[PDB]
């Protein structure tokens, strides 16, 4: 006999429990609603049995039914009180079980009536576990109910401790419902927040460098052509320049612009800016003065380090310090007093952001120190090593080249433009000088694999999708990834096999990588999503662009971690390696350069003849993209003019390699234009001229190219020039990079045989 109120919100009314209870001639009132004290279905009730009831009973009821309200909670009850107990048992790797217990004032803290341990298998899904747990607790209830109703079971207190979860705690994990135990813990291990006690970065870059100098002062720090500087020599010179900089009022977090070509003076001035206390802003002297003015405007830089050669390219915009004027260097050669702390800026580099002119990416000392401190032991760089300073001065590839190796006591070899494009000669230099390790952009690196090289032990590549891995050296090859906003690379991969999609590898020190969906929730391993970065790699954000910083540098709503929303799509592979999958937004990597097409379209448009422009990135069927500038106009505009037009405001790498005239743009009914629709794509007298035409035909993917056509106007870019040079070397005679631009048609090139007939 006796009446039982069965409370549930998730279990059905045909539960094994309910059917069993009335089988024993209890009338079981089933209730799936919220109840209060005065409620009409509470007067003649003897037992309350709650199973997965989604509300808390007001204490008046639990007090009126002391000892007669039992709850079924599928958890080893000290552990995983509250919601989603089985899920949390797995994730938090707690003991597993089910508990029948008495209800109290608080959430599941009442004394245990019956409890029993249960086990999950690695291959059970989260839903499987949930069911197995329910099945277990229902049968436990059925076996022991007779004992409970007769009150012959001694209740015992739960052991102190345990965990508790509310409904929302599982939001972040909402996409994991169908995952298995193995996959879920694997996912956990990959994204598990490190345990407290992880060591923070306690020093700034220039601080660690000074240490490196103290230990190996007479080792060669940097080499340019025949000239070189030791660590002691380099440290002292930078110090002298640094004192002057601080004397002119440079303070921590101050921007100091540097406008120089690759040289010893460049390394000296960079180090001087750090040691002085501020952060350096690299300004390519071959940039349009307008562009140079802008970088100087956006940056608050009151001081500019430059040579007499490039001085007015700043157009009096800023106070100038000549790196070749002896007045610029102080007598003092001792290391400056430290005034910078690790979260201070170390440098500011401009990259193409999503909208407007350009963004100044702020990178901090601890960021840079983290990357170097990872780099040295990872690649086992010793003072015995020698590294090439290849990448341009305004991109973090140079930061990779310069900083990581100086802290290892290795020697930097400045690559002058003399060999920069001629990789055959660069290779010879390497074999001659014994260049053991360096970073080459994907475009250069893929071409450098062709060189007969015995010099290298390790080469690192990144910044564009790596396609080729066949190489003629015995050195190891590495592919890394990382946006400029997160301090050079956050992820590294050792290329061991060929791949259709070469992974970008695993995260570096003090960094975690999260693949999240649009709701910012975890994606299962193997499942694509947006790539999020967490840790020491994150910069301060965009200079004077706080709104944009807020968008890309988010505080995660469920986790509260500062995270960088890359805009990159990616996935975890089973081996833990990350695989890059492109981007939804129209932002592209052109020859390793970050490029927003919408940054170029407006400069194209203010041309007095065109009225509408869109520029797109297209593939070479080699897996990477080139820029095409689409413009509407009365008549075709000569490629040369457009190039110079844009060239007055934009850096050369931003200038498209193809321009397409259209009389009209195709339009979708909804929107302005449908991008998808835009179309895609004189014999020589002597035979020597002919034998130049076909190498040219190959390099530009052109059949039977006419001699009188301009190299640039036929899709020529720097890498296409490089390939042409080596193709002219392997089966022909030698040509320089700069010579090719002065003589861009084959006709002028044919004239080059005057140079060797003169010899
Ligand atoms: P032309 O393109 O003008 O000749 C230049 C080129 C491609 C031959 C090569 O020298 C070059 O300068 N390539 C791009 C240089 C660069 O630094 N791109 C940014 C690097 N991208 C990244 O993702 C890096 N930040 C990480 C470290 C891989």
Ligand 1, residue 481: give the atom nearest the CA: 28
Whole-number Å distance, alpha carbon 442 to ligand 1 midpoint, is 8
Token pair listed for 97: 């079980």
Name the nearest CA neighbour of 222 among 437, 390, 412: 412
DSSP output for 474-508: SSEEEEEE--GGGSS-SEEEE--S--SS---BEE-
CA distance 249 to 243: 10
Q: Among the atoms of ligand 1, which is closest to the Cα of residue 483?
A: 23
Among the atoms of ligand 1, which is closest to the Cα of residue 591?
7
- Contacting residues for 5 by C-beta, under 8 A, at least 6 apart: 28, 29, 31, 41, 42, 45, 47, 48, 49
Pocket of ligand 1 (CB under 6 A): 391-392, 395-397, 400, 441, 443-444, 462-463, 480, 482, 484, 488-489, 591-593, 653, 717-719
Residue 220's alpha-carbon distances to 217, 380, 397, in angstroms, are 8, 18, 21
CA of 441 from ligand 1 middle (Å) equals 5
Task: For residues 335 and 337, give the distance between their C-alpha atoms in angstroms, rounded to a whole number.
Answer: 7
Which parts of 397-542 are beta strand (E)? 411-414, 437-439, 458-462, 476-481, 491-494, 506-507, 511-516, 529-535, 541-542
What's the CA gap between 182 and 283, in Å, rounded?
51
Query: How far apart are the CA of 614 and the centre of ligand 1, in A?
Result: 24
Closest protein CA for atom 8 of ligand 1: 719
Give the containing element (helix H, strand E) for 303: strand 303-306
Q: Show the 3-state SS of 86-124.
A: HHHHHHCCCCCEEEEEECCCCCCCCCEEEEEECCCCCCC
Which residue has tokens 């494009």? 421
Longest dimension (CA), the chain: 119
CB 549 within 8 A of CB 541: yes
CA of 720 to the centre of ligand 1 (A): 14
Determine the Cα angle at 690 with ends 685 and 692, to 5°.
130
- Asked if 367 contacts 506 with a C-beta cutoff of 8 angstroms, the reply is no
Distance (angstroms) between ligand 1 centre and the Cα of 478 equals 16
| Beta-bridge mates of residue 29 | 5
CB contact at 8 A, 638 and 688: no
Which of 134, 75, 133 lies closest to 101 in space, CA to CA? 75
Going by C-beta distance under 8 Å and a sequence separation of 6 or more, which residues neighbour residue 337? none
Ligand 1 centroid–CA 355 distance in Å is 22
Residues 6+ away with beta carbon under 8 Å from 334: 239
CA-derived radius of gyration, the chain: 34
Return the structure tokens found at 394: 């305004």
Q: How far is the CA of 593 from the centre of ligand 1 (A)?
A: 6
Q: Are strands 541-542 and 359-364 parallel, antiparallel or unpaired?
A: antiparallel
**Pairing verdict, β 491-494 and 476-481:** antiparallel
Closest-CA residue to 310 (of 281, 282, 286): 286
Atom of ligand 1 nearest to the CA of 420: 10
Q: Residue 264 is inside which H or E element, if any?
A: helix 264-276
Residues pairing with 589 in the sheet: 594
> If you write DSSP's letter for every residue of 638-670 in order, what string do you get?
-HHHHHHHHHTTS-GGGS-SEEEEESS----SS
Q: What's the CA gap between 694 and 702, in Å, rounded?
A: 9
Protein residue whose Cα sits closest to atom 21 of ligand 1: 463
CA 43 to ligand 1 center in whole angstroms: 79
CB 126 within 8 Å of CB 100: no
Which atom in ligand 1 lies closest to the alpha carbon of residue 439?
27
Angle at 521 between CA 520 and CA 523, to 5 degrees: 120
Which of 351, 423, 591, 655 has most ligand 1 atoms within 8 Å of its beta carbon, as the pocket-test mutant?
Answer: 591
H helical segments located in 523-638: 546-552, 601-605
Residues 442/623, Cβ–Cβ less than 8 Å: no
Question: Residues preceding discontinuities in the chain at C–N > 2.5 Å?
Answer: 681
Entry field: residues in the chain: 759
Q: Which two tokens stand for residue 465?
A: 């999708």
Distance 420 CA to ligand 1 centre (A): 12
Q: Locate 59 and state its tokens.
A: 């204490």
CB neighbours (10 Å) of residue 383?
A: 16
For the CA of 441, the closest atom of ligand 1 is: 13
DSSP string for 581-611? EEESSS-EEETTEEE-GGGTHHHHHTSTT--
Query: Tokens 């501020």, residue?
Result: 278
Cα–Cα dist 351/488, whole Å = 12
The whole-angstrom separation of Cα 452 and Cα 419 is: 16
Do the beta carbons of residue 597 and residue 613 sit within 8 Å? no
- Ramachandran assignment for 277, one of left (phi > 0), alpha (psi -120 to 50 degrees), beta (any other): left
How many A from CA of 155 to the centre of ligand 1? 71
Beta strand pairing call for 411-414 and 220-224: parallel
Residue nearest ligand 1's atom 24 by CA: 463
Residue with tokens 């157009």: 315
Nearest to 712 by CA among 699, 729, 703: 699
């Amino acid at each position: 006999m006796g009446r039982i109120l069965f409370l549930t919100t998730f279990m059905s009314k045909g539960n094994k429990v309910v059917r069993y209870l009335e089988s024993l001639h209890h009338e079981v009132v089933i209730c799936q609603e919220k109840v209060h004290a005065q409620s009409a279905n509470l007067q003649e009730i003897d037992w309350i049995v709650s199973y997965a009831y989604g509300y808390i009973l007001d204490k008046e009821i639990v007090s009126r039914f002391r000892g007669r309200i039992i709850n079924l909670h599928p958890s080893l009850l000290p552990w995983n009180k509250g919601r989603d107990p089985v899920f949390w048992s797995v994730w938090d790797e707690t003991p597993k079980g089910v508990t029948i217990h008495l209800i109290d004032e608080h959430v599941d803290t009442g004394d245990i009536l019956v409890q029993e341990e249960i086990a999950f298998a690695d291959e059970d899904t989260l839903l499987d576990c949930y069911n197995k747990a329910n099945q277990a607790i229902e049968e436990l209830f059925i076996r022991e109910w007779e004992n409970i109703v007769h009150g012959r079971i001694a209740p015992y207190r739960q052991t102190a401790g345990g965990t508790l979860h509310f409904k929302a705690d599982r939001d972040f994990y909402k996409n994991l419902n169908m995952t298995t135990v193995r996959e879920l813990l694997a996912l956990k291990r990959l994204c598990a927040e490190p345990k407290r006690g992880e060591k923070p970065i306690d020093k700034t870059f220039h601080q660690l460098f000074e240490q490196q100098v103290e230990m190996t002062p007479d080792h060669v720090a940097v080499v340019d052509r025949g000239q070189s500087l030791t660590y002691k020599q380099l440290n002292e010179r930078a110090n002298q320049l640094a004192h002057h900089l601080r004397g002119k009022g440079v303070k921590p977090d101050d921007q100091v612009a540097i406008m120089l070509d690759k040289s010893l003076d460049m390394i000296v001035s960079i180090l001087a800016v750090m040691k002085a206390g501020g952060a350096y802003v690299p300004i390519d002297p071959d940039y349009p003065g307008e562009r140079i003015a802008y970088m100087l405007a956006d940056s608050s830089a009151a001081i500019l380090l430059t040579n007499a050669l490039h001085e007015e390219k700043a157009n009096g915009a800023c106070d100038i310090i000549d790196v070749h004027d002896p007045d610029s260097y102080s007598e003092n050669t001792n290391n400056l007093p430290h005034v910078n702390r690790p979260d201070d800026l170390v440098y500011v580099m401009y990259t193409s952001g999503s909208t407007g002119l350009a963004k100044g990416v702020m990178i901090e000392h601890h960021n840079l120190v983290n990357f170097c401190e990872w780099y040295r032991p990872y690649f086992g760089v010793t003072p015995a090593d020698k590294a090439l300073v290849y990448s341009s001065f305004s991109f973090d590839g140079s930061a990779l080249d310069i900083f990581t190796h100086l802290l290892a006591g290795a020697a930097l070899h400045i690559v002058p433009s003399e060999r920069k494009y001629d990789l055959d000669a660069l290779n010879d230099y390497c074999n001659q000088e014994g260049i053991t390790i360096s970073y080459l952009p994907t475009g250069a690196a893929e071409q450098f694999m062709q060189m007969d090289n015995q010099s290298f032990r390790v080469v690192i590549t990144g910044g564009d999708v790596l396609k080729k891995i066949e190489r003629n050296g015995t050195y190891k090859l590495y592919n890394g990834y990382g946006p400029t906003e997160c301090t050079i690379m956050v992820t590294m991969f050792e290329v061991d096999k060929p791949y259709a999609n070469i992974p970008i590898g695993k995260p570096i020190d003090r960094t975690r990588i999260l693949i999240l969906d649009e709701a910012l929730a975890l994606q299962p391993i193997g499942v694509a999503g947006e790539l999020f970065i967490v840790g020491e790699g994150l910069g301060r954000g965009y200079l004077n662009r706080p709104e944009l910083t807020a968008e890309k540098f988010i505080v995660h709503p469920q986790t509260g971690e500062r995270m960088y929303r890359t805009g990159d799509r990616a996935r975890f592979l089973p081996d833990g390696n990350i695989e890059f999958l492109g981007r939804l937004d129209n932002l592209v990597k052109i020859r390793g350069y970050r490029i927003e097409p919408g940054e170029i379209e407006p400069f194209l448009m203010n041309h007095p003849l065109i009225e509408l422009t869109t520029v797109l990135a297209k593939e070479q069927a080699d897996g990477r993209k080139y820029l095409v500038g689409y413009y509407v106009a009365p008549e075709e505009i000569p490629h040369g003019e457009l190039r110079e037009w844009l060239g007055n405001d934009l850096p050369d790498y931003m200038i498209p390699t193809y321009f397409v005239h259209m009389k009209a743009f195709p339009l979708t009914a909804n929107g302005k234009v449908d991008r998808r629709a835009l179309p895609d794509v004189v014999a020589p007298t002597d035979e020597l001229e002919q034998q130049l035409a076909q190498v040219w035909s190959h390099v530009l993917g052109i059949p039977q190219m006419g001699i009188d056509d301009h190299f640039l106007e036929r899709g020529g870019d720097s890498i296409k020039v490089m390939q042409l040079i080596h193709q002219l070397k392997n089966i022909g005679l030698s040509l320089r990079y700069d010579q090719l631009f002065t003589h861009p048609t084959i006709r002028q090139l044919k004239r080059l045989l005057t140079e060797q007939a003169a010899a």
